[PDB]
Every structure is written in structure tokens, then in C-alpha cells.
Design a protein around this ligand. Structure first.
Ligand code: NDP
Ligand code: PO3
Ligand code: PO3
Ligand code: MN
Ligand code: MN
Lengths: 377, 370
């Protein structure tokens, strides 16, 4: 039947692709809510106009000043819209830890949560797990989407390993010597998924973050979650079972596919994306990740094994470190060095967070600690 | 603990199956062995190891040499099946001779772990009529892969099944080059059939019979590494694939243990070292055997038995130095072209035998004229 969808982060990259999917499938989906931050207010108003959804929220009260007929506005608007709207699916495509609370509200309503917001799991960790029930969270990320598909290839008891694929970033195969002179422009650093995104995939912190999320979503121990470099990005991830069989998910890159699947779970959406084409020659290459040169994934596994607020620390330390590198203050290899520095001092943050404020507090501590590492103070 | 009868126990599949069984006594027990009689040493050894005396030997003289074989003669494997209480029949015979033991296995209500693809291709709707849904679990890698990948969705979400083909030893060769191929370069039936691409054609038919999807939604792609064993493409554009280093113990173990996987059955893909999985279209003009299989499959009825039986005769002639390599598929085409009578649905096993008899003679006739 028709699923009722609240789209949080409607004006972002994931949120707009989801509305594409939804417009293309009015049989299967209906938008009943939209929420945005306020920075792209004009897009939200166009979206109100073109979908006819008046049930909309704007996080920034100051930006909400420009409109006058928003039923939900201010710091807790997305949360309140989630609380007050009857829905079957909440797509959380918000950016930053501000996505955490709307995630919790979504879980509490009993609606299915299509999760795009990284920090919900990476920072919110045990808060989100305590609040989620099985099958409630469906991941939007292509790796995690792939994993959920491949897991249909056996029972949980039959899983030997989860293998995430990684593009390798622009410095795939580079020596550590080469990495010493990397500049922001070489590493990426765009009108959409640009800024922080390209930097995390150049540094493989993005993979580290994905490894944590994989553990939290799927329950597989960190020592059985692998990463392989796969430059074409056709195989998005795979699962090795205990008999030696590997099941893999494959498609030409297009976020509309995992997005469509997150929305319609467990039923697939006819024509969401183009299939692989075996009418023409091609190849899928794999190479191991050099973990001496890129220890960002192993760092994440250490933070993840520590647990509690530690992955909040890991991510926050990264965000500060990358900023220092983007600002010319530090060298590229120093990004993961500062992250490790902060993690080594953070033993107090192994406790389980009780509240959102605990997560935010972990985050502030990591930033300050990383800031001191950058400045030598 | 599953009671398993192993037909063709001395062969490549059979010995590997016994090893898997040997390695999991908690799950599997051999209760029967069938063999041709060409490898008595291997057979005696398996008897001593498994302690099974419930044994079928096809060759009368061979069975005589061994002594105390309860089933001997041409129908011995079939009689062993009919009389042995079993949960699983592993049919790892080679050739369309596997047809009767396959039908017998199905009638006993046991699971048919099928390595002998020929019996299904020949039997067609006859074998299907005899089977319960899911009674036939494939041992063939492609089909074992497809079965796993189909867990990726419900049937109405399936867009396409994609079989992988190694391309054989003569992948990339021209028709002209193929004229010179010797039996040594195509080196048993498996090996030759992989080279001629007839094996892929049989697998395309097996795909339609096992999974019930139309021939125009079954694709073939050449993948020379043979790591990806087959894939399913769903209507949303997602493809689910199965992959493992080539080792028949994996699909054997799964066919035996279905729906449960057997830990340690085989080595997994190793991503601690670099590799490349390549794909290219099949050169169908140089290798038309897969297209000939589809034409046979779409005609249906006893036509697929004809396709296989023609090949068996032609392959024998090639291996004997009587014809050239390209003449294998040429003869199949010639025999198929004359096989108008055989589009009828087989109603008994005799219908299938009749079609095969005709096709064999017709293939000898074509060998005569060249
Ligand atoms: N890796 C592989 O080998 C693969 C095999 N397959 C399929 O599995 C099936 C078995 O192939 P494979 O194991 O390679 O073949 P083999 O030639 O290695 O084995 C054939 C077996 O059948 C026995 N046999 C038993 N009864 C008879 C009889 N009445 N007449 C003739 N032979 C008899 C032979 O015994 P004996 O030798 O003692 O006479 C032998 O054990 C084939 O249909 C093949 O297509 C499919 C995929 C991969
Ligand atoms: O590095 P990419 O796979 O996120
Ligand atoms: O060579 P095989 O894939 O038929
Ligand atoms: Mn990703
Ligand atoms: Mn095969």
C-alpha cells in the first residue's frame, strides 16, 4: 500500500534524491512532512508548493522569520514534527548531532526509521540502540544497504565476516611519503556532498565511521568487519558466510537505490536505478588497504570496541582535525594522528551515554582536546 | 543426521562429496554408493572408509570381480535408490543415463541433490512433474549461486538471472582457430562441454527448469576467473551475486545441508590480497551452443533431451578423433533442425528415451556424412 513518509533534511542531497524517488512512485509513497535547517529556505518553500505539504518544519527560528506560516519552527521543530505527525517511515537525512534527537523521537513513535544521519549511531550509539527495536532502523548508506541485502543470504549465526568496500579516495595506493605533502585541494575540498565528505573518504575516516555504524546496526564484532579497496565502487559491500560463500551487492553508483530500498523496506522499488550492464566488458578490482598508511579504520575499531561515548569522541576529534588541515594548520597525515591522540586520553568517555547532553559533552571534550593538539597548548 | 545416497561416488563430485560427509559426521551419513565399475580401487576404499556395503555397480563383470555387490547391471543405481531409505539422494552420475535414478530419487520423496544436470535437461517437464517444490537442490555452482542470490528478493522482484561462464580454454579464439583444436587441448565430458560451451547451454536449460523463468530473462556473461558463480538482477537495479574460489565442496555441502550452510566447507574469497573479477560478453557467433540451447529450451517438450543426446554422441566422436571440434555444435544444430517430432511433452520416461534414441542415431547419421 501507500507509505506515509516524513522527510527530515528535505533540502539536502539525500533528502532531495528521496523526493525524486517519491515523486516517481506515488503508488508507494506519500510525503506528509518536510523539515530543513533554514539555510535553503527557498528550496523548502518550493517543495511546500510543489508537493502541497503544509506540514513543514524549520530548525532555525531566525530563518523561520522570513516565512510566517511554518507550523514548526525553532530548535526542536523537526522533533516536534516527528512527534506530532502520523507516519509509517521517517527519513532522517539531517546533518550533524542535531539529527540525533529526531532519530530518538522517530524510534519512540514506532515508525520505521530510514537513517542517513551519521552521528545518530556514531555519536548517539547506545542511546539509539536502547531506543530502537529490531528491523526498525533501515540504513540509507550504500555500504549498509548492501550489507542488509547480502544478509538475506543466511542466518545471523552463519555470518563469518562483513566486508565493506572502499573507493580508496584520491590517494589510493599512495606511499606515506607521498601523503606528507597532500594539500586540501588534492584531497577534494562543491554544491552538495563536498566539504567534509571528500576529506573523510580521502582519509578513510568515512570508512572508519561506516565500520562503527556496521557494528551497531548489525551486531558483528569489530574483528569480523573488514574493509577492502574496490576503485570502481560497483560492489558496495558483501558478506562472507561460514561455509565459505560470499554474497555481494552490486550496482552502478546511484544513491537513489539504497534510498528507495530504505523507504520501501522490505519491498524493492521498480526502476529506482540502473542495473550493472554485462553486455559490455568491465572489471571489478580489489586490493588490500595498507593500514600502516591509512590507520583510520583500525582507529575506529579501537574507539568502537571501547564503546560508550568513544565513537562520539572519534568523530568529533576528526571534525576538528580535518578543519585544522583544511585551514593549513596541520599536515594531512596529522588528521588521523590527532584523532589517535585524543582517543588515547579519553578513557573517561568509555561510559555509556545516559542523555543527549552526554553525547554533546563527549563531543565538546574531543574538539577542545584536538584543538590543543593542533595548537600545541 | 541426514542419510545420504551417493550416486557416482568414485567420480570428481562423488569423492568430494564423501569428503564433505566425512568432515561432518554430525550432519551427514553415507547409506549407499553407486559407481560405473571403471574404478574398483576407489570403490573398495570408499566401502572400507564409509563401511557401506549397500553398493550399486553398473558393469556386470566389474561387480563380479568385486564380489558381494547387491545391485549390478545397467539399472543398478536406479534399484539402489528405490530400495534404500534416505533423506538425500546425491546424483553425481554423468550423462543422460542419470535420468532413471533421478526420477526414482524424486518418487521416494527424498531430496535430490543434483549434480547430474543432464538428467534434468533430458527429463524436462517429466522430472518437474515428479518433483515436489524445492525437492531438487542444485549442486551445479551457477545454480547453487542463483538459489542463494534469489534470497535477495521475492519472485516478482526478479528481473534477470545472470549465469557466468569461464569461456573455456578457447575463449577469444576465432572459428578458424577452433578448426585445429585437438582432444588434448579440450582436456572429462565436463571439460569438453566447458570448452564447447555446451555446458553453459545445458546450464541455461537447467536454469529455466529449476527456477521457472523465461529464456529471454536468463543471461550469460563470460567471467574468466570463475569467482562469481552467478547473479540475480532485481527490478530496482540491484544485483546480488555469489562468489568463492572454485571448489565444488561449497555447493555440494549446501545441497546436502539445505537450507543450512555447512561451516568450513570451503575457503572464502581472500581480500587480503589483490584480485580482479572480469566480465565480457560471450562471442555467440563463434560459440552458438548457448543460443542453440535456448532454441531447444523454448521449443520444450523432449527437445532438450535431443539437444543433450546429440551432444553426447558428437562429443564421443570428437574425443575419438573422428570429427573436428567445430563439428560438435554443428551436428547438434543439424539434429535439432530435424527434431520437429520432439516438441511433444514427455508423458513417460519412454518418451524421453525415444527422443534420445532418435537423436543419437540422427547424430551418427551426421557423423557419417562428414
Ligand atoms: N567439478 C565437477 O566435476 C562438476 C560436475 N558437474 C556435474 O556433475 C555430474 C558428475 O560429474 P563428474 O563427477 O565430473 O563426473 P565423473 O566422470 O568424475 O563421475 C561419473 C561417475 O558416475 C559413475 N557411474 C555410476 N553408475 C554409472 C553408470 N551406470 N554408467 C556410467 N557411469 C556411472 C562413475 O563411476 P566409475 O568411474 O567407477 O565407472 C563415476 O563415479 C555431471 O553431470 C557434471 O555435469 C557439475 C559441475 C561441476
Ligand atoms: O571511500 P568511499 O567508498 O566512501
Ligand atoms: O567453463 P564453464 O563455465 O562452463
Ligand atoms: Mn558510504
Ligand atoms: Mn556449472
Amino acid at each position: 500500500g501507500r507509505l506515509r513518509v516524513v522527510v527530515l533534511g528535505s533540502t539536502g542531497s539525500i533528502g532531495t534524491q528521496a523526493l525524486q524517488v517519491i515523486a516517481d512512485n506515488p503508488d508507494r509513497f506519500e510525503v506528509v512532512g518536510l523539515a530543513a535547517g533554514g539555510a535553503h529556505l527557498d528550496t523548502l518553500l518550493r517543495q511546500r508548493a510543489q508537493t502541497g505539504v503544509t506540514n513543514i518544519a524549520v530548525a532555525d527560528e531566525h530563518a523561520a522569520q522570513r516565512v510566517g506560516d511554518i507550523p514548526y519552527h525553532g530548535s526542536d521543530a523537526a522533533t516536534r514534527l516527528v512527534e506530532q505527525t502520523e507516519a509509517d517511515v521517517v527519513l532522517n537525512a539531517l546533518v550533524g548531532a542535531l539529527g540525533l534527537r529526531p532519530t530518538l523521537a522517530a524510534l519512540k513513535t514506532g515508525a520505521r526509521l530510514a537513517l542517513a544521519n551519521k552521528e545518530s549511531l556514531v555519536a548517539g550509539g547506545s542511546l539509539v540502540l536502547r531506543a530502537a527495536r529490531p528491523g526498525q532502523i533501515v540504513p540509507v548508506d550504500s555500504e549498509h544497504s548492501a550489507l542488509a541485502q547480502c544478509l538475506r543470504g543466511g542466518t545471523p549465526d552463519e555470518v563469518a565476516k562483513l566486508v565493506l568496500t572502499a573507493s580508496g579516495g584520491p590517494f589510493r595506493g599512495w606511499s606515506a611519503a607521498d601523503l606528507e605533502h597532500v594539500t586540501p585541494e588534492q584531497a577534494g575540498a562543491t554544491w552538495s556532498m563536498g566539504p567534509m565528505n571528500t576529506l573523510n573518504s580521502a582519509s578513510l575516516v568515512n570508512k572508519g565511521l561506516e565500520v562503527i555504524e556496521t557494528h551497531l546496526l548489525f551486531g558483528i564484532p569489530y574483528d569480523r568487519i573488514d574493509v577492502v579497496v574496490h576503485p570502481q565502487s560497483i560492489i558496495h559491500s558483501m558478506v562472507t558466510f561460514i561455509d565459505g560463500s560470499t554474497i555481494a551487492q552490486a550496482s552502478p553508483p546511484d544513491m537513489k537505490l539504497p534510498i528507495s530500498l530504505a523507504l520501501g523496506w522490505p519491498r524493492r522499488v521498480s526502476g529506482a536505478a540502473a542495473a550493472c550492464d554485462f553486455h559490455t566488458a568491465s572489471s571489478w578490482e580489489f586490493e588490500p588497504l595498507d593500514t600502516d598508511v591509512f590507520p583510520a579504520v583500525e582507529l575506529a575499531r579501537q574507539a568502537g570496541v571501547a564503546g560508550g561515548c568513544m565513537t562520539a569522541v572519534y568523530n568529533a576529534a576528526n571534525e576538528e582535525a580535518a578543519a585544522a588541515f583544511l585551514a593549513g594548520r596541520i599536515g594531512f597525515p596529522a588528521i588521523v594522528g590527532i584523532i589517535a591522540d585524543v582517543l588515547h586520553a579519553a578513557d573517561q568517555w568509555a561510559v555509556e551515554p545516559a542523555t543527549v547532553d552526554d553525547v554533546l559533552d563527549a563531543q565538546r571534550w574531543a574538539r577542545e582536546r584536538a584543538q590543543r593538539a593542533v595548537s600545541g597548548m
